[PDB]
């Protein structure tokens, strides 16, 4: 079934869902369409916040209902990325984020294409397919960004 997710601006997303889908699932679909992490989304129906572990049917959400979405200013975890020129940027991340998605967030924030990005932590170059957790990158760790020609 279809549901509609509108924001304060007016932007309206359409989603295909099931009544047994949870609010976490709806937030994951919204991340798939809009790139917004679920811990930066608040969903509201009938004037109240929806809790992630409940289902659409739990909250009386029938077909073509409309939820409201409010974006947070920040999620649950930030890391720091230091550049060769000494600049410090702050990133919203998840422990399961791949290095490729970290580079994509860096592109969002600074405009550097990921294929030019080389991230280093604890003296090691980070491989695109692995997660922050794989490298034991914790909250407020510092990555070092270097640009590189991926071909010399």
């Amino acid at each position: 079934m279809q549901i509609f997710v509108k924001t304060l601006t007016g932007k309206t997303i359409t989603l295909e869902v099931e009544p047994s889908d949870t609010i976490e699932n709806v937030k994951a679909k919204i991340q798939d369409k809009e790139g917004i992490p679920p811990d930066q989304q608040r969903l509201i129906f009938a004037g109240k916040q929806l809790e992630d572990g409940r289902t659409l049917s739990d909250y009386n959400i029938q077909k073509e209902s409309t939820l409201h979405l409010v974006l947070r200013l920040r999620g649950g975890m930030q890391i720091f990325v230091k550049t060769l020129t000494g600049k410090t940027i702050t990133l919203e991340v998840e422990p399961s984020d791949t290095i490729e998605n970290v580079k994509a967030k860096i592109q969002d924030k600074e405009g550097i294409p990921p294929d030019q990005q080389r991230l280093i932590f604890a003296g090691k170059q980070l491989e695109d397919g692995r997660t922050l957790s794989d490298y034991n990158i914790q909250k407020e760790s510092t990555l070092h960004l270097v640009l590189r020609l991926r071909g010399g």
């Binding site: 304060l8 608040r42 509201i44 004037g47 916040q49 409201h68 409010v70 947070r72 200013l73 920040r74 930030q78 407020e140």
Partner: protein, 62 residues
């Protein structure tokens, strides 16, 4: 044109969210500040010792 009510609903929500985020950020900012103060303490302490030792060293020199 009088969904005003709903926007009142939503703005009140945004306010509550933003305050939370501000407080969360402030929480981190204050903790790091403490973590910083500690480091300065340690530096101070270490400087103390290396100038105490050195001073004693200069008493032995001739």
């Amino acid at each position: 044109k009088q969904e005003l009510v709903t926007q009142n609903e939503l703005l009140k929500q945004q306010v509550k969210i933003f305050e939370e985020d501000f407080q969360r950020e402030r929480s981190d900012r204050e903790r790091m500040n403490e973590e910083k103060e500690e480091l300065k303490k340690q530096v101070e302490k270490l400087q103390a010792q290396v100038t105490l030792s050195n001073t004693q060293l200069k008493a032995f020199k001739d």
